[PDB]
Design a protein around this nucleic acid. Structure first.
Ligand code: ANP
Ligand code: MG
Length: 508
RNA sequence: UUUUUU
C-alpha cells in the first residue's frame, strides 16, 4: 500500500457541525444529536477526521490525537452518518465493528453511542450491542437478535467467540472496522486476534474481501504502526491524519508532571501515602485521584493500605482484571459520577477510560509498557480541564525516565528526592494485616513484572531485581530477611546459579 | 507479569 501523511496545519479554516451540515457531509439528524450536547465546538481531531472518514475515496484512516480530546466521537459521528447514508440497505445488519483492548473501554464506547441516542430518539433505529467477556453470552445474542444492531462494540476474545458461530447471520455486510487504542491492539497477544477478526469479516463480506475500510485511533501512533497493521488494512491508500507535530511529545502539555525519586521501591508506597494525606488536608477532602500499580496482587495490597489510612476521608475503589465484571462496571459508573475518591488500578484502566474531573494521576512504579506512561497521566486533564501527575519510583527505575526522554521526547521538569520518616513507616506497616506468605506472593508478582520490562526500560537486572525483592524485608520490618523459597522453584525461574537470585532469595 | 472468549 501507500501512506499519505496529512500533518498539523497552522491556520486551517475551522470546521463546525453547522459547516458540515451545509456541505452535505452531515445529515440533520446527527447534527442535531451532537449540537444538543452543548459542546463549545468540534475538537481538532473531530474537525480533521469526520469528512475524510465519510469521503467517497477508497482509503483506510489512521488518526493520532492527544488524550482527552474527543477521539471517540471522531469515529462515532461519521459511523452514524454512514448508517443514515445507507439506511435502506441491509438494515438488520452490522455495518460498523469497533474493537477495544478492555471490556470497560468497550462498554464506555457503547455508553457514548447511547448518549447520541438520548439526544435524538430518531437515531435509536441504528441500534448497538456490546460483546465483551465476563457478560452472559446468551443474553448478548438475544440482544443481537432482538435489536439487529448496525453497530457492534467488542473486546477481541468475545468477538472471535461470536464470529465463529454467527458471522453469517449478522456480519456479512460490515463496511467499517475501528481499532481504538490501535497501537495496543497490534502488540503481541492482540495482533493475532485482530488478524483473525479481520480475516473472518473479510471472507464473509458479501461485496468483496477488500470492502471493509479500517480506522485506527490512538494518542500513541507513528508510521511504524501502519506496517504492523498491514495484514488487516484492505485499501490501496492510507490517510495519516495527525493533530500532533512530528517532534512534539505525545503527552498532553496541560498536565503538570513530576517524579518523586526514592532510594527503595517500597519507599514509593510511603511517599504516595504522605502525598495523598497532604492533598486531602489542603483540598479539604475534595480530591479525586487515580493511582496505578504494576500488578493485580500489589494493587489489592495497595488498596488495603489506602483504606486503612483514608477510608474515613474518601472512598477507595479497587479496579483490576480479577474484580468481577459486574463490579468493574458498577465501580466505573460510580467513579465517573463521583466528585472525589481514589481509584486504585492496574493498567486495565490506563487507556481510554474517561473519568471527569480527576485532579491527579499517581503512579507507584512503572507502567506495563512505555506508551502507557502517556495514557496513564492522560486520565487527568481531559476535555479542557487541568490536572497534575506524580510518578513515584526508586533510583534503580530511573532508566525508565531516561527512555521517556530518548524514545518519546518527554522531559519531566519537576523532580525531587524522598526519604521516609520512621513515623510514617510504623503508621503504614502496623496496619498491614497480610501474612508473610501473602507479602511473598505480592513481592514475587512484582519481580515477574519488573523482570519482563528490564530490556524495554534499560534496567540493570543486577540492581533492579534485588531492590524489588528486598521489598519483602521492608514490609516485614527486617531488611536482612530474604524471601523464603524452595530449590525446585528457583530452578524454574532460571536463577539457581545466578548471584542475582542469591541476593533475592533464601532457600528455606 | 498487564490485558484479552470459555
Ligand atoms: N467537541 C467536544 N467538545 C467538548 N468536549 C468533548 C467534545 N467531544 C468529546 N468531548 C468530551 O471529551 C471527553 C473525552 O473524550 P474521549 O473521546 O474519551 O477522548 P479520547 O481522545 O478518546 N481520550 P484517550 O482515549 O484517553 O486517548 C468526553 O467526556 C467527551 O464528552
Ligand atoms: Mg479514547
Amino acid at each position: 500500500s501507500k501512506l499519505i501523511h496529512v500533518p498539523k496545519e497552522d491556520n486551517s479554516k475551522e470546521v463546525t457541525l453547522d459547516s458540515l451540515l451545509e456541505e452535505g457531509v452531515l445529515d440533520k439528524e446527527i447534527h442535531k444529536a451532537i449540537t444538543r450536547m452543548e459542546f463549545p465546538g468540534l475538537t481538532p481531531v473531530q474537525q480533521k477526521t469526520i469528512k475524510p472518514i465519510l469521503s467517497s475515496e477508497d482509503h483506510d484512516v489512521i488518526a493520532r490525537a492527544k488524550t482527552g480530546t474527543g477521539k471517540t466521537f471522531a469515529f462515532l459521528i461519521p459511523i452514524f452518518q454512514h448508517l443514515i447514508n445507507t439506511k435502506f440497505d441491509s438494515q438488520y445488519m452490522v455495518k460498523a465493528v469497533i474493537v477495544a483492548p478492555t471490556r470497560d473501554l468497550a462498554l464506555q464506547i457503547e455508553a457514548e453511542v447511547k448518549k447520541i441516542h438520548d439526544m435524538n430518539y430518531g437515531l435509536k433505529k441504528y441500534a448497538c450491542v456490546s460483546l465483551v467477556g465476563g457478560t452472559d453470552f446468551r443474553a448478548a445474542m438475544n440482544k443481537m437478535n432482538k435489536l439487529r444492531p448496525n453497530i457492534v462494540i467488542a473486546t477481541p476474545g468475545r468477538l472471535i467467540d461470536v464470529l465463529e458461530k454467527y458471522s453469517n447471520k449478522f456480519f456479512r455486510f460490515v463496511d467499517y472496522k475501528v481499532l481504538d487504542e490501535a497501537d495496543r491492539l497490534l502488540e503481541i497477544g492482540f495482533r493475532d486476534d485482530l488478524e483473525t477478526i479481520s480475516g473472518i469479516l473479510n471472507e464473509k463480506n458479501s461485496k468483496s474481501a477488500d470492502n471493509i475500510k479500517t480506522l485506527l485511533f490512538s494518542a500513541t501512533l507513528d508510521d511504524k504502526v501502519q506496517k504492523l497493521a498491514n495484514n488487516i488494512m484492505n485499501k490501496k491508500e492510507c490517510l495519516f491524519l495527525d493533530t500532533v507535530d512530528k517532534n512534539e511529545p505525545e503527552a498532553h502539555e496541560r498536565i503538570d508532571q513530576s517524579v518523586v525519586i526514592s532510594e527503595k521501591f517500597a519507599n514509593s508506597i510511603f511517599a504516595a501515602v504522605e502525598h495523598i494525606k497532604k492533598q486531602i488536608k489542603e483540598r479539604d477532602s475534595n480530591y479525586k485521584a487515580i493511582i496505578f500499580a504494576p500488578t493485580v496482587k500489589f494493587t489489592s495490597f495497595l488498596c488495603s493500605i489506602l483504606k486503612n489510612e483514608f477510608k474515613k476521608d474518601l472512598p477507595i475503589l479497587e479496579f483490576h482484571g480479577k474484580i468481577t465484571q459486574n463490579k468493574r462496571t458498577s465501580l466505573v459508573k460510580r467513579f465517573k459520577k463521583d466528585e472525589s475518591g481514589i481509584l486504585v488500578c492496574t493498567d486495565v484502566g490506563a487507556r481510554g477510560m474517561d473519568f471527569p474531573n480527576v485532579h491527579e494521576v499517581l503512579q507507584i512504579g512503572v507502567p506495563s509498557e512505555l506508551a502507557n506512561y502517556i495514557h496513564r497521566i492522560g486520565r487527568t486533564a481531559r476535555s479542557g480541564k487541568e490536572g497534575s501527575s506524580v510518578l513515584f519510583i526508586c533510583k534503580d527505575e530511573l532508566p525508565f525516565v531516561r527512555e521517556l526522554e530518548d524514545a518519546k521526547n518527554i522531559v519531566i521538569a519537576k523532580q525531587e528526592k524522598y526519604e521516609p520518616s520512621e513515623e510514617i513507616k510504623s503508621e503504614v506497616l502496623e496496619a498491614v494485616t497480610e501474612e508473610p506468605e501473602d507479602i511473598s506472593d505480592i513481592v514475587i508478582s512484582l519481580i515477574s513484572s519488573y523482570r519482563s520490562c528490564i530490556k524495554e526500560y534499560r534496567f540493570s537486572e543486577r540492581r533492579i531485581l534485588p531492590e524489588i525483592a528486598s521489598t519483602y524485608g521492608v514490609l516485614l520490618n527486617d531488611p536482612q530477611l530474604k524471601i523464603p523459597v524452595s530449590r525446585r522453584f528457583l530452578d524454574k525461574l532460571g536463577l539457581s546459579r545466578s548471584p542475582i537470585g542469591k541476593a533475592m532469595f533464601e532457600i528455606r
